[PDB]
Each structure stands twice: as C-alpha cells, then as structure tokens.
C-alpha cells in the first residue's frame, strides 16, 4: 500500500480521447485513507476490526 501501488499508478497515469486531440485525463496521486464503515445515510465512522 505504501510504495508498490504508487509505482503501479505511475506506470499508467494518463488516458487520451478518441477525438478532440490533446483531450486526456490524468492522475497525479492516489490515497487509501483508513478503515471505516459505510452507512445507509451516505455517512461513515471508524469501527474496530
């Protein structure tokens, strides 16, 4: 999670259009946060394992 994933993301970092040249989408960083539980109200909180 700390390093390898960063390299994997770097290895593939941009996607370009079929038309409209120079139209592309770019990643710049990737994050993982920390564990939490989803809720039915589009809300979350941390929870012990």
Partner 1 sequence: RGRCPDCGSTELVEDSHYSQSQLVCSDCGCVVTEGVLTTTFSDEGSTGENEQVSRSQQRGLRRVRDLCRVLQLPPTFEDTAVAYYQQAYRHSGIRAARLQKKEVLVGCCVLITCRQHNWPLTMGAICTLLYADLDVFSSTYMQIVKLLGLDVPSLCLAELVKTYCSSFKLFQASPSVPAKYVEDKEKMLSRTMQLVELANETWLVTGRHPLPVITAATFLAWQSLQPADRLSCSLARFCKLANVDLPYPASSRLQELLAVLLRMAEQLAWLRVLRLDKRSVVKHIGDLLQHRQSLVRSAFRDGTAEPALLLPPCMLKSPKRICPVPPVSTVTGDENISDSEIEQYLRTPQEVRDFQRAQ
Interacting residues with partner 1 (CB under 8 A): 38, 40-43
| Dmax (CA) of the chain | 49
| Cα distance between residue 9 and residue 30, in whole Å | 8
Q: Measured from the CB atom, is 40 or 48 closer to partner 1? A: 40
Please, what is the minimum distance in Å from the beta carbon of residue 42 to partner 1? 5
Q: How far is the CB of 45 from partner 1 (least distance, A)?
A: 10
User: Strand, helix or coil at 38?
Assistant: strand
CB of residue 10 vs partner 1: minimum separation in angstroms? 27
């Amino acid at each position: 999670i700390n390093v390898e994933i960063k390299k994997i993301m770097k290895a593939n970092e941009k996607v370009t259009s079929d038309a409209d040249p120079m139209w592309y989408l770019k990643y710049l960083n990737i994050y993982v946060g920390l564990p939490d539980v989803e809720e039915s109200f589009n809300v979350t909180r941390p929870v012990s394992p």
